[PDB]
Amino acid sequence: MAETLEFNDVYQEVKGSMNDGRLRLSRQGIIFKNSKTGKVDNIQAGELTEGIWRRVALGHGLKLLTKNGHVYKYDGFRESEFEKLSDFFKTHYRLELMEKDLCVKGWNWGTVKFGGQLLSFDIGDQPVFEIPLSNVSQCTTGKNEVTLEFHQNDDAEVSLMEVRFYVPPTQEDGVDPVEAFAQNVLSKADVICIFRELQCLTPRGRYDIRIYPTFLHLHGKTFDYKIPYTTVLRLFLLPHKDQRQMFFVISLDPPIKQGQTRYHFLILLFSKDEDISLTLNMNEEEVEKRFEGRLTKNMSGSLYEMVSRVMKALVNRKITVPGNFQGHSGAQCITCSYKASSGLLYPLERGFIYVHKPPVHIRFDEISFVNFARGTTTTRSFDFEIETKQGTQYTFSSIEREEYGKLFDFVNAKKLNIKNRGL
Amino acid sequence: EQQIQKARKSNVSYKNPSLMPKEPHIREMKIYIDKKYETVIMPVFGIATPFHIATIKNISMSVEGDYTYLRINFYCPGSALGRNEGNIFPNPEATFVKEITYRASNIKAPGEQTVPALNLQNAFRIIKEVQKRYKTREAEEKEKEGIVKQ
Amino acid sequence: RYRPGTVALREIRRYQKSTELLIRKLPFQRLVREIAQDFKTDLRFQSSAVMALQEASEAYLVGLFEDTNLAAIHAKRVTIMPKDIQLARRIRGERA
DNA sequence: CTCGTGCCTGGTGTCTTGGGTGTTTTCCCCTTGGC
DNA sequence: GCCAAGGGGAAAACACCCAAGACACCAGGCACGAG
């Protein structure tokens, strides 16, 4: 065998990225000239503990474990080259290319083993895959869930940026496996904020808002979306007629493309008593710097008031609120129907908005004319007609005689053109 | 008189590491789908790792400024919602890969045969295809069993 | 099955020729006093008046739930949602 | 004195919206025609 | 030849039905409360 063996098709995995290199096995150790960095990585036989031969992206790879706790993965070896590699391996490293087979059964259940830096996830004793823990750049915990976010190593290819593990609570031991597991990961890891459990009416579901510097990553139970703050046309705070909830609206332009369907709005529903606590993973100087002392790095209080303030900053849009419109029933909106559904029509101080699906907004400037037709509740009830300057017509049906006068007083106060005003 | 019995099988992608494919995407650090084996092959931190489509619950994708994020959600405790089969898994106390999220830039990088995001966009699309086909063949067996040959 | 839970609850359906008030009398009586107080002070409430209100309201709310169930059923829904109460009230025209 | 009210958990099941039909209506392409 | 009117075709806007799934409700259980 040669005293050293050289190859050019092998690679090495580091911090969420694979890296090719000119591997040079020697009597002294493995010397690898990484071509992405040009660096020569030399690991001596004395630093090593184990060698493994198994599948990777470019076919098969060589896994090397050091006494240092650092665990190195190598790729690009063809499974057919085994003899050339292992013969030299056994001769100088007194080690062999062991069969720690990847579990190709394709299951998601397994076992997590902290084999130093290389965390192994194994179906029984066959690792499905293993991650060098040093690759974790940010980390968070939730009930029965471990979040691993790798370094945003933009120099990588199709890169596994996030992996999450679901950890069933242990039956034999009362100690929390998430904290225990989370700290064990963190004992090798390399680690803005999340408004957790947000009740969205649009899109429908419960999402966790992972705030980011220029966008909010609305993390969901299957889908997720990032909304660049630049796209928000407006922010609205609409008090629910129940006097117990509030609808927070975010006009989106562009609309998020929910599969084929698209939303020109983001609608949130929160109760007036739905308190929460928020922590910014930012320095207080930065918090003061961006928020003029109107807020603090740590706060607690009603989610609606708090969220309205937090997002008002990230997007700068002012919180839009209804004018002095408060119906005969006192609500700042009117019971109505638009299309094949019912929702709330809000007489804003400078426009009209139909709350909940299909969500629609109107500005007094877009109105051509409107009218209070003889409605559907009583012979003196009303239905409200709207036609836009765009020729697009909207009409809100079925509204009590009681709300006729208030909207009658309101539109005259907004001085908009009513079809029957010439009567 | 007496009660009724049932049986179940495991979702094995490949019998051994040698039977698993060697398709170009795998080499190319690309998320791949092996339709013949109802299996998705993905580069898990440089490791070509298979996942039988039967483990994937559903998928999602997001464009995050300069990047395209493909998110793969898998069946696991608490995620396998609605089914009375809570803890579907042959070993529910095992830890589970809840989900996998890959990102690739929306912009074609130098020398590529396909945009980084193009692999995600095709894997995303093809997963829904193979998944629905599998769900459908599965649904057949549920509706098919319990019928007397006329 | 002769065991408890079976016998009493089973037979209670037949023992229940009684017309037990479904809202707790004192918890309710306090609310009566409270709303009464909300209206005016010095209001002595005869237990008879408290009963009169309690029984009427329970049947009345059950009545409201009859309509609400219909309306849920109407919408092809089992779970009633406040919109049903509202629908029912609107249709009954029993609104302030 | 102890039954009733309540905080907490898991599950469902059941309400929501996405995907889709085909009906009532408009804007557009195609072509002939009149000054 | 330049300039214009008409029938028709493909499509859009709507009221409605069918499918999926997630949350939010009841069911289950241990504990505090005040009838």
Swiss-Prot record, chain A:
Can you name this protein?
FACT complex subunit SSRP1
What biological-process GO terms show up in the record? DNA repair; DNA replication; nucleosome assembly; nucleosome disassembly; regulation of chromatin organization
| Biological role stated in the UniProt entry | Component of the FACT complex, a general chromatin factor that acts to reorganize nucleosomes. The FACT complex is involved in multiple processes that require DNA as a template such as mRNA elongation, DNA replication and DNA repair. During transcription elongation the FACT complex acts as a histone chaperone that both destabilizes and restores nucleosomal structure.
- Primary place of residence? nucleus
Instruction: List, alphabetically, the GO terms of the cellular component aspect.
Output: FACT complex; nucleolus; nucleoplasm; nucleus
* Complexes and interactors: Interacts with MYOG (via C-terminal region). Component of the FACT complex, a stable heterodimer of SSRP1 and SUPT16H. Also a component of a CK2-SPT16-SSRP1 complex which forms following UV irradiation, composed of SSRP1, SUPT16H, CSNK2A1, CSNK2A2 and CSNK2B. Binds to histone H3-H4 tetramers, but not to intact nucleosomes. Identified in a centromere complex containing histones H2A, H2B and H4, and at least CENPA, CENPB, CENPC, CENPT, CENPN, HJURP, SUPT16H, SSRP1 and RSF1. Interacts with isoform gamma of TP63. Interacts with FYTTD1/UIF. Interacts with SRF. Interacts with NEK9.
Provide the alphabetized UniProt keywords.
Acetylation, Chromosome, DNA damage, DNA repair, DNA replication, DNA-binding, Host-virus interaction, Isopeptide bond, Nucleus, Phosphoprotein, Transcription, Transcription regulation, Ubl conjugation
**Parent-record interval covered:** 1 to 430 of 709
Gene encoding this polypeptide?
A: SSRP1
Give the family this protein belongs to, as stated in its UniProt record.
Answer: Belongs to the SSRP1 family.
**Molecular function per GO:** DNA binding; histone binding; nucleosome binding; RNA binding
Report the locations given in the UniProt record.
Nucleus; Nucleus, Nucleolus; Chromosome
- Residues modified to Phosphothreonine: 170
Keyword Cytoplasm attached = no
As stated in the Swiss-Prot or TrEMBL entry, residues carrying the post-translational modification N-acetylalanine are 2
Q: What else is known?
A: Autoantibodies against SSRP1 are present in sera from patients with systemic lupus erythematosus, but not other rheumatic diseases.
**Chain positions of cross-link Glycyl lysine isopeptide (Lys-Gly) (interchain with G-Cter in SUMO2):** 90, 289, 357
Q: Which residues carry this modification: N6-acetyllysine?
A: 226, 406
Curated annotation (Swiss-Prot), chain B:
What outcome follows a substitution of residue 73 to S? Answer: In NEDDFAC; uncertain significance
Which residues fall in a compositionally biased region of kind Polar residues? 1-16
Q: Where is the segment annotated Disordered?
A: 1-20
Q: Glycyl lysine isopeptide (Lys-Gly) (interchain with G-Cter in SUMO2) cross-link position in this chain?
A: 15, 149
Any idea which residues bear N6-acetyllysine here? 15
Q: Where in the cell is it found?
A: Nucleus; Chromosome
Modification after translation: ADP-ribosylated. ADP-ribosylation by PARP1 is induced by genotoxic stress and correlates with dissociation of FACT from chromatin.
Q: Which residues carry this modification: Phosphoserine?
A: 10
Disulfide connectivity for this sequence is none
Reading the lineage from the top rank, the first entry is Eukaryota
In the record, the note on similarity to other proteins reads:
Belongs to the peptidase M24 family. SPT16 subfamily.
Q: How does it assemble?
A: Interacts with MYOG (via C-terminal region). Component of the FACT complex, a stable heterodimer of SSRP1 and SUPT16H. Also a component of a CK2-SPT16-SSRP1 complex which forms following UV irradiation, composed of SSRP1, SUPT16H, CSNK2A1, CSNK2A2 and CSNK2B. Interacts with NEK9. Binds to histone H2A-H2B. Identified in a centromere complex containing histones H2A, H2B and H4, and at least CENPA, CENPB, CENPC, CENPT, CENPN, HJURP, SUPT16H, SSRP1 and RSF1. Interacts with GTF2E2. (Microbial infection) Interacts with Herpes simplex virus 1 (HHV-1) protein ICP22; this interaction relocalizes the FACT complex to viral genomes in infected cells.
Domain remark in the UniProt entry? The C-terminal Glu-rich acidic region is essential for FACT activity.
User: Which disorder is recorded?
Assistant: Neurodevelopmental disorder with dysmorphic facies and thin corpus callosum: An autosomal dominant disorder characterized by global developmental delay, impaired intellectual development with poor or absent speech and language, and autistic-like behaviors. Corpus callosum anomalies are visible on brain imaging. Most patients have dysmorphic features including tall forehead, down-slanting palpebral fissures, ear anomalies and broad nasal bridge. Other variably present clinical features include seizures, sleeping difficulties and precocious puberty.
What is this protein identified as? FACT complex subunit SPT16
Q: Which part of the complete sequence is present?
A: 499 to 648 of 1047
Curated annotation (Swiss-Prot), chain C:
Tell me the residues on which N6-(beta-hydroxybutyryl)lysine occurs: 17, 40, 83
Q: Which GO terms describe its biological process?
A: chromatin organization; gene expression; negative regulation of transcription by RNA polymerase II; nucleosome assembly
Modified residues annotated as N6-glutaryllysine in this record: 17, 40, 76, 83
Q: How does it assemble?
A: The nucleosome is a histone octamer containing two molecules each of H2A, H2B, H3 and H4 assembled in one H3-H4 heterotetramer and two H2A-H2B heterodimers. The octamer wraps approximately 147 bp of DNA. During nucleosome assembly the chaperone ASF1A interacts with the histone H3-H4 heterodimer (via C-terminus of H3); this interaction is direct. Interacts with DNAJC9, CHAF1A and CHAF1B. Interacts with NASP; NASP is a histone chaperone that stabilizes and maintains a soluble pool of Histone H3-H4 dimers.
* Modified sites of kind N6,N6-dimethyllysine: 40
Give residues where N6-(2-hydroxyisobutyryl)lysine occurs: 17, 25, 40, 83
Q: Name one GO cellular component term.
A: nucleoplasm
Q: Please list the GO terms describing molecular function.
A: chromatin binding; DNA binding; protein heterodimerization activity; structural constituent of chromatin
What name has this protein been given in UniProt?
Histone H3.2
Question: PTM N6-crotonyllysine: at which residues?
Answer: 17
UniProt keyword annotations, A-Z: Acetylation, ADP-ribosylation, Chromosome, Citrullination, DNA-binding, Hydroxylation, Lipoprotein, Methylation, Nucleosome core, Nucleus, Palmitate, Phosphoprotein, Ubl conjugation
Q: Which residue positions does N6-methyllysine occur at?
A: 17, 25, 40, 83
Q: Which residues form a coiled coil?
A: none
Lipid group attachment sites (S-palmitoyl cysteine): 71
Q: Which organism is it from?
A: Homo sapiens
Q: Which residues carry this modification: N6-succinyllysine?
A: 17, 40, 83
